[PDB]
Design a protein around this ligand. Structure first.
Ligand code: HEM
Ligand SMILES: [C-]#N
Length: 137
């Protein structure tokens, strides 16, 4: 289930973080614009760039912490607030997060590894709701 999926992702955090983030950028190329230093780089080029690995690792570590603190895939109000109030997320709207979770769910469904993809879709939905309420446009 969802708790096991957190363990699966954490077990190989850098690999999953990189592969899911790339699936996101590749499904929604307009999103790459927000990450000026990943512009003009192939998947393998990014996998060799230390800063890409560090970014994705930090993002997915935080995502997994928010997931782990959730109850029944409903994230904490404080965690949603953290994501909204982060200076790095000042320009974002909930659609940016929607796209990340659509790509993440698509990745999980296409994977040979078992995932509770339905629960991640619902987690994403619940996170988007919590982000909106916390002030995200
Ligand atoms: C639940 C989902 C998300 C989590 C947990 C998250 C988490 C984080 C974390 C921990 C950082 C700082 C990491 C570092 O030091 O590099 C960061 C930075 C950033 N995030 Fe997110 N993020 C999420 C979604 C998004 C989305 C959907 C976008 C836009 C499409 C976005 C845009 C950015 C940008 C532009 C930065 C700054 C990167 C830089 O320093 O160049 N984030 N995020
Ligand atoms: C940042 N994702």
């Amino acid at each position: 289930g969802f708790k096991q999926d957190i363990a699966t992702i954490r077990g190989d955090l850098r690999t999953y973080a990189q592969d899911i983030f790339l699936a996101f950028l590749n499904k929604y190329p307009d999103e790459r614009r927000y990450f000026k230093n990943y512009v003009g780089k192939s998947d393998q080029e990014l996998k060799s760039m230390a800063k890409f690995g560090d970014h994705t690792e930090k993002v997915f570590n935080l995502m997994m912490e928010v997931a782990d603190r959730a109850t029944d895939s409903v994230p904490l109000a404080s965690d949603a607030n953290t994501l909204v109030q982060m200076k790095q997320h000042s320009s974002l709207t909930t659609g940016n997060f929607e796209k990340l979770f659509v790509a993440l769910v698509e990745y999980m469904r296409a994977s040979g590894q078992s995932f509770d993809s339905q629960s991640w879709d619902r987690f994403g939905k619940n996170l988007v709701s919590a982000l909106s309420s916390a002030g995200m446009k």
